[PDB]
Design an enzyme around this catalytic site. Structure first.
Site, PDB file in Angstrom:
ATOM      1  N   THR A 100     -11.275  18.597  -2.979  1.00  0.00           N
ATOM      2  CA  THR A 100     -11.587  18.564  -4.410  1.00  0.00           C
ATOM      3  C   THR A 100     -10.778  17.515  -5.162  1.00  0.00           C
ATOM      4  N   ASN A 123      -5.329  17.917  -0.895  1.00  0.00           N
ATOM      5  CA  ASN A 123      -4.979  18.934  -1.894  1.00  0.00           C
ATOM      6  C   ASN A 123      -3.509  19.296  -1.811  1.00  0.00           C
ATOM      7  N   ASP A 139     -18.587  26.047  -5.907  1.00  0.00           N
ATOM      8  CA  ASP A 139     -17.544  26.047  -4.891  1.00  0.00           C
ATOM      9  C   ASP A 139     -16.891  27.434  -4.708  1.00  0.00           C
ATOM     10  N   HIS A 147     -14.741  23.030   3.018  1.00  0.00           N
ATOM     11  CA  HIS A 147     -15.120  21.623   3.050  1.00  0.00           C
ATOM     12  C   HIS A 147     -13.861  20.867   3.313  1.00  0.00           C
ATOM     13  N   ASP A 206      -4.394  -1.842   6.361  1.00  0.00           N
ATOM     14  CA  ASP A 206      -4.663  -1.753   4.898  1.00  0.00           C
ATOM     15  C   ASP A 206      -6.149  -2.034   4.554  1.00  0.00           C
ATOM     16  N   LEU A 231      -7.718  -4.750   5.140  1.00  0.00           N
ATOM     17  CA  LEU A 231      -7.859  -6.099   4.648  1.00  0.00           C
ATOM     18  C   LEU A 231      -7.428  -7.093   5.715  1.00  0.00           C
ATOM     19  N   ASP A 265      -5.736  -9.577   8.107  1.00  0.00           N
ATOM     20  CA  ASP A 265      -4.327  -9.998   8.280  1.00  0.00           C
ATOM     21  C   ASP A 265      -4.170 -11.490   8.195  1.00  0.00           C
TER      22      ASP A 265
HETATM   23  C1  LIG Z   1      -9.288  -0.775  -2.944  1.00  0.00           C
HETATM   24  O1  LIG Z   1      -9.079  -1.337  -4.258  1.00  0.00           O
HETATM   25  C2  LIG Z   1      -7.684  -1.392  -4.543  1.00  0.00           C
HETATM   26  C3  LIG Z   1      -7.372  -1.778  -5.983  1.00  0.00           C
HETATM   27  O2  LIG Z   1      -7.914  -3.065  -6.239  1.00  0.00           O
HETATM   28  C4  LIG Z   1      -6.970  -2.377  -3.603  1.00  0.00           C
HETATM   29  O3  LIG Z   1      -5.566  -2.164  -3.715  1.00  0.00           O
HETATM   30  C5  LIG Z   1      -4.851  -3.259  -4.287  1.00  0.00           C
HETATM   31  O4  LIG Z   1      -4.648  -4.322  -3.340  1.00  0.00           O
HETATM   32  C6  LIG Z   1      -3.595  -5.280  -3.446  1.00  0.00           C
HETATM   33  C7  LIG Z   1      -3.166  -5.754  -2.029  1.00  0.00           C
HETATM   34  O5  LIG Z   1      -2.768  -4.671  -1.154  1.00  0.00           O
HETATM   35  C8  LIG Z   1      -2.358  -4.760  -4.214  1.00  0.00           C
HETATM   36  O6  LIG Z   1      -1.692  -5.896  -4.757  1.00  0.00           O
HETATM   37  C9  LIG Z   1      -0.232  -5.800  -4.613  1.00  0.00           C
HETATM   38  O7  LIG Z   1       0.352  -5.162  -5.751  1.00  0.00           O
HETATM   39  C10 LIG Z   1       1.743  -5.304  -6.035  1.00  0.00           C
HETATM   40  C11 LIG Z   1       2.029  -4.704  -7.417  1.00  0.00           C
HETATM   41  O8  LIG Z   1       1.445  -3.416  -7.366  1.00  0.00           O
HETATM   42  C12 LIG Z   1       1.776  -2.523  -8.462  1.00  0.00           C
HETATM   43  O9  LIG Z   1       0.992  -2.807  -9.617  1.00  0.00           O
HETATM   44  C13 LIG Z   1      -0.375  -2.388  -9.642  1.00  0.00           C
HETATM   45  C14 LIG Z   1      -0.975  -2.687 -11.036  1.00  0.00           C
HETATM   46  O10 LIG Z   1      -0.771  -1.673 -12.028  1.00  0.00           O
HETATM   47  C15 LIG Z   1      -1.250  -2.095 -13.337  1.00  0.00           C
HETATM   48  O11 LIG Z   1      -2.633  -2.409 -13.397  1.00  0.00           O
HETATM   49  C16 LIG Z   1      -3.020  -3.189 -14.535  1.00  0.00           C
HETATM   50  C17 LIG Z   1      -3.510  -4.564 -14.027  1.00  0.00           C
HETATM   51  O12 LIG Z   1      -4.489  -4.422 -12.983  1.00  0.00           O
HETATM   52  C18 LIG Z   1      -1.938  -3.208 -15.665  1.00  0.00           C
HETATM   53  O13 LIG Z   1      -2.479  -3.565 -16.930  1.00  0.00           O
HETATM   54  C19 LIG Z   1      -1.195  -1.856 -15.821  1.00  0.00           C
HETATM   55  O14 LIG Z   1       0.046  -2.070 -16.453  1.00  0.00           O
HETATM   56  C20 LIG Z   1      -1.024  -1.098 -14.483  1.00  0.00           C
HETATM   57  O15 LIG Z   1       0.211  -0.419 -14.385  1.00  0.00           O
HETATM   58  C21 LIG Z   1      -0.523  -0.917  -9.202  1.00  0.00           C
HETATM   59  O16 LIG Z   1      -1.881  -0.560  -9.088  1.00  0.00           O
HETATM   60  C22 LIG Z   1       0.200  -0.612  -7.879  1.00  0.00           C
HETATM   61  O17 LIG Z   1      -0.019   0.762  -7.563  1.00  0.00           O
HETATM   62  C23 LIG Z   1       0.251   1.160  -6.187  1.00  0.00           C
HETATM   63  O18 LIG Z   1       1.548   1.698  -5.939  1.00  0.00           O
HETATM   64  C24 LIG Z   1       1.896   2.860  -6.718  1.00  0.00           C
HETATM   65  C25 LIG Z   1       3.265   3.351  -6.253  1.00  0.00           C
HETATM   66  O19 LIG Z   1       4.196   2.333  -6.552  1.00  0.00           O
HETATM   67  C26 LIG Z   1       0.855   4.005  -6.645  1.00  0.00           C
HETATM   68  O20 LIG Z   1       0.927   4.922  -7.730  1.00  0.00           O
HETATM   69  C27 LIG Z   1      -0.596   3.517  -6.560  1.00  0.00           C
HETATM   70  O21 LIG Z   1      -1.349   4.587  -6.020  1.00  0.00           O
HETATM   71  C28 LIG Z   1      -0.756   2.232  -5.715  1.00  0.00           C
HETATM   72  O22 LIG Z   1      -0.546   2.561  -4.342  1.00  0.00           O
HETATM   73  C29 LIG Z   1      -1.401   1.857  -3.403  1.00  0.00           C
HETATM   74  O23 LIG Z   1      -1.189   0.421  -3.334  1.00  0.00           O
HETATM   75  C30 LIG Z   1       0.081  -0.021  -2.781  1.00  0.00           C
HETATM   76  C31 LIG Z   1       0.215  -1.550  -2.745  1.00  0.00           C
HETATM   77  O24 LIG Z   1       0.565  -2.030  -4.031  1.00  0.00           O
HETATM   78  C32 LIG Z   1       0.322   0.605  -1.389  1.00  0.00           C
HETATM   79  O25 LIG Z   1       1.598   0.242  -0.900  1.00  0.00           O
HETATM   80  C33 LIG Z   1       0.140   2.146  -1.415  1.00  0.00           C
HETATM   81  O26 LIG Z   1       0.088   2.682  -0.118  1.00  0.00           O
HETATM   82  C34 LIG Z   1      -1.193   2.567  -2.044  1.00  0.00           C
HETATM   83  O27 LIG Z   1      -2.217   2.303  -1.086  1.00  0.00           O
HETATM   84  C35 LIG Z   1       1.675  -1.037  -8.025  1.00  0.00           C
HETATM   85  O28 LIG Z   1       2.345  -0.164  -8.926  1.00  0.00           O
HETATM   86  C36 LIG Z   1       2.200  -6.760  -5.924  1.00  0.00           C
HETATM   87  O29 LIG Z   1       3.564  -6.770  -6.248  1.00  0.00           O
HETATM   88  C37 LIG Z   1       1.879  -7.283  -4.508  1.00  0.00           C
HETATM   89  O30 LIG Z   1       2.406  -8.604  -4.233  1.00  0.00           O
HETATM   90  C38 LIG Z   1       3.172  -8.806  -2.969  1.00  0.00           C
HETATM   91  O31 LIG Z   1       2.494  -9.509  -1.914  1.00  0.00           O
HETATM   92  C39 LIG Z   1       2.128 -10.871  -2.219  1.00  0.00           C
HETATM   93  C40 LIG Z   1       1.541 -11.527  -0.971  1.00  0.00           C
HETATM   94  O32 LIG Z   1       0.585 -12.479  -1.382  1.00  0.00           O
HETATM   95  C41 LIG Z   1       3.238 -11.769  -2.841  1.00  0.00           C
HETATM   96  O33 LIG Z   1       2.698 -12.784  -3.678  1.00  0.00           O
HETATM   97  C42 LIG Z   1       4.247 -10.996  -3.694  1.00  0.00           C
HETATM   98  O34 LIG Z   1       5.435 -11.756  -3.755  1.00  0.00           O
HETATM   99  C43 LIG Z   1       4.514  -9.569  -3.170  1.00  0.00           C
HETATM  100  O35 LIG Z   1       5.299  -9.653  -1.971  1.00  0.00           O
HETATM  101  C44 LIG Z   1       6.602  -9.022  -2.135  1.00  0.00           C
HETATM  102  O36 LIG Z   1       6.611  -7.601  -1.926  1.00  0.00           O
HETATM  103  C45 LIG Z   1       6.436  -7.161  -0.574  1.00  0.00           C
HETATM  104  C46 LIG Z   1       6.345  -5.635  -0.510  1.00  0.00           C
HETATM  105  O37 LIG Z   1       5.007  -5.272  -0.787  1.00  0.00           O
HETATM  106  C47 LIG Z   1       7.508  -7.748   0.355  1.00  0.00           C
HETATM  107  O38 LIG Z   1       7.188  -7.417   1.684  1.00  0.00           O
HETATM  108  C48 LIG Z   1       7.556  -9.282   0.216  1.00  0.00           C
HETATM  109  O39 LIG Z   1       8.495  -9.873   1.126  1.00  0.00           O
HETATM  110  C49 LIG Z   1       7.698  -9.695  -1.278  1.00  0.00           C
HETATM  111  O40 LIG Z   1       8.962  -9.351  -1.834  1.00  0.00           O
HETATM  112  C50 LIG Z   1       0.341  -7.200  -4.356  1.00  0.00           C
HETATM  113  O41 LIG Z   1      -0.334  -8.043  -5.264  1.00  0.00           O
HETATM  114  C51 LIG Z   1      -2.684  -3.738  -5.325  1.00  0.00           C
HETATM  115  O42 LIG Z   1      -1.531  -3.163  -5.895  1.00  0.00           O
HETATM  116  C52 LIG Z   1      -3.584  -2.605  -4.838  1.00  0.00           C
HETATM  117  N1  LIG Z   1      -3.907  -1.704  -5.962  1.00  0.00           N
HETATM  118  C53 LIG Z   1      -4.043  -0.370  -5.889  1.00  0.00           C
HETATM  119  C54 LIG Z   1      -4.400   0.435  -7.150  1.00  0.00           C
HETATM  120  O43 LIG Z   1      -3.902   0.254  -4.839  1.00  0.00           O
HETATM  121  C55 LIG Z   1      -7.369  -2.125  -2.172  1.00  0.00           C
HETATM  122  O44 LIG Z   1      -6.956  -3.230  -1.411  1.00  0.00           O
HETATM  123  C56 LIG Z   1      -8.869  -1.832  -1.961  1.00  0.00           C
HETATM  124  N2  LIG Z   1      -9.065  -1.404  -0.578  1.00  0.00           N
HETATM  125  C57 LIG Z   1      -9.907  -2.057   0.235  1.00  0.00           C
HETATM  126  C58 LIG Z   1     -10.010  -1.649   1.689  1.00  0.00           C
HETATM  127  O45 LIG Z   1     -10.617  -2.984  -0.164  1.00  0.00           O
HETATM  128 CA   LIG Z   2      -4.375  -6.068   7.124  1.00  0.00          CA
HETATM  129 CL   LIG Z   3      -5.146  18.378   2.209  1.00  0.00          CL
HETATM  130 ZN   LIG Z   4     -13.580  24.279  -2.554  1.00  0.00          ZN
END
Ligand SMILES: *[C@@H]1O[C@H](CO)[C@@H](O[C@@H]2O[C@H](CO)[C@@H](O[C@@H]3O[C@H](CO[C@H]4O[C@H](CO[C@H]5O[C@H](CO)[C@@H](O)[C@H](O)[C@@H]5O)[C@@H](O)[C@H](O[C@H]5O[C@H](CO)[C@@H](O)[C@H](O)[C@@H]5O[C@H]5O[C@H](CO)[C@@H](O)[C@H](O)[C@@H]5O)[C@@H]4O)[C@@H](O)[C@H](O[C@H]4O[C@H](CO)[C@@H](O)[C@H](O)[C@@H]4O[C@H]4O[C@H](CO)[C@@H](O)[C@H](O)[C@@H]4O)[C@@H]3O)[C@H](O)[C@H]2NC(C)=O)[C@H](O)[C@H]1NC(C)=O
Ligand SMILES: [Ca+2]
Ligand SMILES: [Cl-]
Ligand SMILES: [Zn+2]
Ligand SMILES: O=C(COc1ccc(OC(F)(F)F)cc1)N1C[C@H]2CN(C(=O)c3ccc4[nH]nnc4c3)C[C@@H]2C1
Ligand SMILES: [K+]
Ligand code: NA
Length: 804
Positions: free
Chosen positions: A159, A180, A261, A420, A687, A689, A691
């Protein structure tokens, strides 16, 4: 701490949430233990019930009544929903003929048609047909508006993950609500159904529709309703909010029903006790539509009737116990039920080992009703891996079963008959979608689609820019009369090279041999023609895929196939070929069994070598264009080029060979020819996406040949199968898969048998959308067809599910 000493007078279901310690009166205060002392008295009136009776008509307003039948009730916005019927001779909405709504018909001051989302928990797709006699209101929305035969939920089919996927357009792995029940190891905090942790903002990722609306100046009603607020009150509150002055009135609203449900869990999906909850939902839908008709809004508002998941028959006696498999049962924590998630009970236990847990759970009993996976080996279509809250070990449970840790968990924790949570392709988990209103189409059935796509359309309905999400924006344009979103194809980022013959054979030192020194302008001008692309329109039916990232690659043409060969990954990104219904399968000639040939268009330095495969005791190789389908003995030499070779584990060559030798021809026979695009996928950080090169964790030993985590194929033909795949004039038909490239066939419990008894079943489990392959490869397919881009977007989101 709330000073609950203030009053709710004229604040009932106020839309600003006032901050502590003023007392609250919003539809959520109960759940926070924060309602003003008089919330119940003033805001939850029940006197006289929910319906006008003949004698109440024109009554003197009495503010103690739950709703009113007085003359001033329409302007106060608080009539009982059946007021006009009872007191003014009006008809119920369900009794009115339906009439196309070509334009919104809204009162003055409405800037846009409001959106009402009527969400129903556990509403299984087949209830639309099976319950249709007892749901006339719902049946009217469905036949008059736009409906799908079913809508696919996300995995797990629980849910909270599905309602929040509906709100955000994101997979659970990205929005963070992955079950959940959850544990987050970074927070060291647990999320539970019962309690206050689940309210904390840090669980809730993404940007749900009410926040998208709010940030863009569109006001939203509150989506959450406390369980004890009766449905009739929820409806009357929505209708009241719809009479607010223009500047205060929301444009988007949600209603949520715990039924069917709640009864489905007790009685099973089709228990005789289920008819009542379906009648009762329908009566609520009628109260809403009657209330809209009264406010002159029934041809103004867009209504979405939408479920989160279905419901399956599941009983206590169909439980598998991990204590029947594992000796060390007390060293694990299990998240149990219709899925399993396993982690160590203590992080200080260094004797903990996932490999021995998985092995103890694998193919251990003949009828075993769950299958263990490391999360990265789950079917990529589930998109259930990329989050720290998803435990590395996962159990996919068969439909109709539970998994629990020990029998004592079931009897001292039958009590239930439905549940479910299972795989989101299971028929019993499918749910419903109907849209009705000026912006939806009139009496239109649309194909099944996934719930991740609705957020974009809800944004479209309200004129909002969606936050980035997992829908494919434009894939649902066919649901809409207007407000369509017109996407453009993405620009190609890298252009291919077209290499001619540039290398002599002796420049290659690859340790490869081929028995090929066997050999006119008849058969010599012809071969030149084929290497320049002369048969390219047979094999490349929808244009070359576009490369949407920066890379270096070559187009290579051959009589029977065309490829885009990556100089960086040393193998094709894609290989395209057409197999007509007439095509014949041949074997690899004896002399050519180990043949690999240098490709004189491609430098030794950008080629694989046979030595590495010799030295690598674990890894063998296969070919993307299959030598079995060569059009002639001479064309067959092309299939042994080094540039058509890909690294494959022997275990995986069993699967691949059967696909290429048996199944392609079978598909070409059934579909009247097929065009196939096949290639490798690298997703080592799971992820979803593509590599980059520095993410590759495994190479062919002693080389720079990267090892794929998966192999894909996209198989396209004509939807009208009376036309052959290569001369198709109209819509297409596609099925695709992303097979995991694994060194064992432990997934397939029957794999010691012949490939005819197990391979096709593996492939079916790993069915995929073309869009899933797009994300994993950075390629864009179908760029040159005669079809509209919107229709192509819908084709790319299609999933072939193999259900009945
Ligand atoms: C499904 O669709 C979704 C959404 O489009 C896709 O997911 C997106 O994909 C991107 C690539 O994986 C990813 O980009 C990251 O993001 C980093 C910043 O992320 C934070 O900010 C996000 C934005 O929030 C704001 O949104 C709007 C603007 O859009 C603003 O106006 C508001 O103010 C909002 O606040 C935010 O969404 C994101 O949330 C995640 O994390 C939170 C916990 O912290 C969770 O609450 C939330 O659920 C999200 O969690 C998911 O995503 C994360 C990955 O971010 C993941 O780990 C979790 O498991 C979970 O799955 C954040 O709060 C940005 O900094 C990244 O940049 C790095 O890499 C690049 C490489 O090119 C470098 O340029 C850069 O320097 C940096 O590298 C550095 O950091 C590394 C560590 O990661 C380190 O190793 C390195 O050496 C460097 O130091 C990058 O852009 C998106 O964040 C992500 N969005 C979401 C919502 O998930 C998804 O791909 C689609 N799926 C498929 C299969 O297609
Ligand atoms: Ca990958
Ligand atoms: Cl569960
Ligand atoms: Zn149920
Ligand atoms: O008030 C709402 C409506 O919440 C939205 C959110 C977005 C939403 O998105 C939208 F609008 F896009 F549909 C619609 C309604 N609630 C959602 C309810 C689920 N609850 C459970 O206790 C629960 C737990 C396990 C279950 N298994 N089976 N049933 C179960 C029910 C209480 C929550 C109260
Ligand atoms: K080898
Ligand atoms: Na096996």
């Amino acid at each position: 701490w709330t000073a609950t000493s203030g009053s709710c007078k004229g604040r009932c279901f106020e839309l600003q949430e006032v901050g502590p310690p003023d007392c609250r009166c919003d539809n959520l205060c109960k759940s926070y233990s924060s309602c003003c002392h008089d919330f119940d008295e003033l805001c939850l009136k029940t006197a006289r019930g929910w319906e006008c009776t003949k004698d109440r008509c024109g009554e003197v307003r009495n503010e103690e009544n739950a709703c009113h039948c007085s003359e001033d009730c329409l302007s106060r916005g608080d009539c009982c929903t059946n007021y006009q019927v009872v007191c003014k001779g009006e008809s119920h909405w369900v009794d009115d003929d339906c009439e196309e709504i070509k334009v919104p018909e809204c009162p003055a001051g409405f800037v846009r048609p409001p959106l009402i989302i009527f969400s129903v928990d556990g509403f299984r797709a087949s209830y639309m047909k099976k319950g249709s006699k007892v749901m006339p209101n719902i049946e009217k929305l469905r036949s008059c508006g736009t409906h799908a035969p079913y809508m696919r939920p996300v995995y797990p089919t629980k849910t909270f993950p599905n309602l929040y996927t509906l709100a955000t357009g994101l997979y659970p792995e990205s929005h963070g609500i992955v079950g959940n029940s959850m544990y987050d190891p970074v927070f060291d905090a647990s999320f539970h159904l019962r309690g206050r942790e689940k309210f904390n903002h840090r669980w809730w990722g993404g940007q749900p529709l009410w926040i998208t609306a709010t940030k863009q100046g569109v006001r939203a009603g509150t989506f959450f309703w406390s369980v004890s607020i009766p449905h009739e009150r929820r409806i009357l509150t929505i209708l009241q909010w719809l009479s607010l002055p223009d500047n205060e009135r929301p444009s988007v609203y949600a209603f949520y029903s715990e039924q069917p449900d709640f009864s489905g869990h007790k009685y099973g999906p089709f228990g005789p006790e289920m008819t009542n909850p379906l009648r009762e939902i329908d009566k609520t839908v009628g109260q809403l539509m009657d209330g809209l008709k009264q406010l002159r809004l029934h041809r103004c508002v867009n209504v979405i009737f939408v479920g989160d998941h279905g419901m399956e028959d599941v009983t206590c006696d169909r439980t598998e116990f991990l204590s029947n498999y594992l000796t060390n049962v007390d060293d694990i924590t299990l998240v149990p039920g219709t899925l399993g998630r396993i982690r160590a009970k203590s992080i200080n236990n260094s004797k903990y080992d996932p490999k021995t847990i998985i092995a103890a759970l694998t193919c251990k009993k003949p009828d075993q009703h769950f299958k263990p996976y490391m999360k990265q080996h789950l079917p990529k279509r589930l998109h259930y891996a990329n989050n720290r809250r998803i435990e590395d070990i996962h159990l996919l449970v068969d439909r109709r079963w539970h998994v629990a840790r020990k029998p004592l968990d079931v009897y001292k924790k039958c009590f239930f008959q439905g549940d479910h949570g299972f795989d989101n392709k299971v028929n019993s988990m499918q749910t419903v979608f109907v849209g009705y209103g000026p912006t939806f189409k009139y009496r239109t059935k649309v194909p099944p689609f996934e719930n991740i796509e609705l957020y974009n359309v809800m944004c479209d309905l309200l004129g909002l820019k969606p936050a980035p999400n997992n829908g494919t924006h434009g894939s649902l344009n066919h649901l809409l009369r207007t407000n369509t979103f017109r996407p453009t194809m993405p620009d190609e980022v890298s252009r291919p090279n077209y290499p001619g013959i540039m290398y002599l054979q002796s420049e290659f030192d690859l340790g490869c041999t081929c028995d090929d020194k066997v050999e006119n302008k008849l058969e010599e001008l012809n071969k030149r023609l084929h290497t320049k692309g002369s048969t390219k329109e047979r094999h490349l039916l929808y244009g070359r895929p576009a490369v949407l990232y920066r890379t270096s690659y070559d187009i290579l043409y051959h009589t029977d196939f065309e490829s885009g060969y990556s100089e960086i990954f040393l193998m094709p990104l894609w290989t395209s070929y057409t197999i007509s219904k007439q095509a014949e399968v041949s074997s690899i000639p004896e002399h050519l069994t180990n043949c690999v040939r240098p490709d004189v268009r491609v430098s030794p330095g950008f080629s694989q070598n046979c030595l590495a495969y010799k030295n690598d005791k674990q890894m063998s190789y296969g070919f993307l264009f299959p030598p079995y389908l060569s059009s002639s003995p001479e064309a067959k030499y092309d299939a042994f080029l080094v540039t058509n070779m890909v690294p494959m584990y022997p275990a995986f060559k069993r699967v691949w060979a059967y696909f290429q030798r048996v199944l392609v021809k079978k598909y070409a026979s059934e579909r009247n020819g097929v065009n196939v695009i096949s290639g490798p996928i690298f997703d080592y950080n799971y992820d979803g996406l593509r590599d980059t090169e520095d993410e590759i964790k495994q190479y062919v030993e002693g080389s720079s040949i990267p090892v794929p985590t998966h192999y894909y194929s996209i198989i396209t033909s004509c939807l009208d199968f009376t036309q052959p795949a290569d001369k198709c004039d109209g819509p297409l038909s596609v099925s695709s898969f992303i097979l995991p490239h694994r060194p064992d066939n432990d997934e397939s419990c029957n794999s010691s048998e012949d490939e005819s008894k197990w391979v096709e079943e593996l492939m079916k489990m790993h069915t995929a959308r073309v869009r899933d392959i797009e994300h994993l490869t950075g390629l864009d397919f179908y760029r040159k067809t005669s079809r509209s881009y919107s229709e192509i977007l819908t084709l790319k989101t299609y999933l072939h599910t193999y259900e009945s």
